[PDB]
Design a protein around this ligand. Sequence first.
Ligand SMILES: CC(=O)N1CCN([C@H]2CCC[C@@H](NC(=O)c3cc4c(F)ccc(C)c4[nH]3)C2)CC1
Ligand SMILES: C[S@@+](CC[C@H](N)C(=O)[O-])C[C@H]1O[C@@H](n2cnc3c(N)ncnc32)[C@H](O)[C@@H]1O
Ligand SMILES: [Zn+2]
Ligand SMILES: [Zn+2]
Ligand SMILES: [Zn+2]
Length: 234
Amino acid sequence: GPSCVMDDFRDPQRWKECAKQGKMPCYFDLIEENVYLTERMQCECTPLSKDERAEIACGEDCLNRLLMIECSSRCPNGDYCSNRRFQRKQHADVEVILTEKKGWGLRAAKDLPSNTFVLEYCGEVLDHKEFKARVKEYARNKNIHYYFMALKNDEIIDATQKGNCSRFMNHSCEPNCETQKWTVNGQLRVGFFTTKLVPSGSELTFDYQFQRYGKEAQKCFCGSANCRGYLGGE
Ligand SMILES: CC(=O)N1CCN([C@H]2CCC[C@@H](NC(=O)c3cc4c(F)ccc(C)c4[nH]3)C2)CC1
Ligand SMILES: C[S@@+](CC[C@H](N)C(=O)[O-])C[C@H]1O[C@@H](n2cnc3c(N)ncnc32)[C@H](O)[C@@H]1O
Ligand SMILES: [Zn+2]
Ligand SMILES: [Zn+2]
Ligand SMILES: [Zn+2]
């Protein structure tokens, strides 16, 4: 299948013409951060010494990391903090590919260890009313793909028009990634993390959970032994 790299999405001109030759996915508005449609301290880690750096600054036992909170610039490890990954776009090396049946997908360019941050899932943040409106909007238009992720009560990310390359991650009944919900400046975000070692060339997948709506659920083509046959939480 045609591949491309995250850098390819930076040139919209080169992208729009790549898309017409189907060597790239359909155009969408690229964003490095979530957009609210309707508008809405620190850890006690011990500052590591610099030859200790040759131990993890803000590791397993960090008060913020334990609450899935990122540190700010005011972290007692300042620059050396390993818990600012979302903020520093410390994304994994991932390519975008055409799958047999699922549309476009993500694959690992290098071997990703377990428990590795992949990408933030970015989009427009909708309330429940905005969501329900859009689902019928999209259904009405006979859209083939759906890009919704539950963030919390009355907050659902919609990657349909605006997002980044996280929106290409396909669902699998038997996945190699999970979502983790992380707090950054008192604002909740969501990102993909490997749950095991993902060999280079491998498609990244996660187990999409989401309350079902309507009658015709999308069929799963994951090919897993334990395939539930349908996408959604049901
Ligand atoms: C009448 C009708 O045609 N339908 C009934 C309503 N249904 C949508 C209900 C709400 C959730 C929609 N699914 C997603 O948004 C979604 C899937 C997915 C995935 F498989 C991997 C990764 C992500 C981020 C994903 N998001 C399906 C569309 C079909
Ligand atoms: C967030 S998008 C994932 C990227 C999508 N392949 C694309 O080209 O934009 C989710 C959509 O991809 C498709 N998809 C994802 N996982 C799938 C699976 N296991 N089986 C079938 N279709 C899948 C469905 O159309 C679903 O609505
Ligand atoms: Zn810390
Ligand atoms: Zn820190
Ligand atoms: Zn499946």
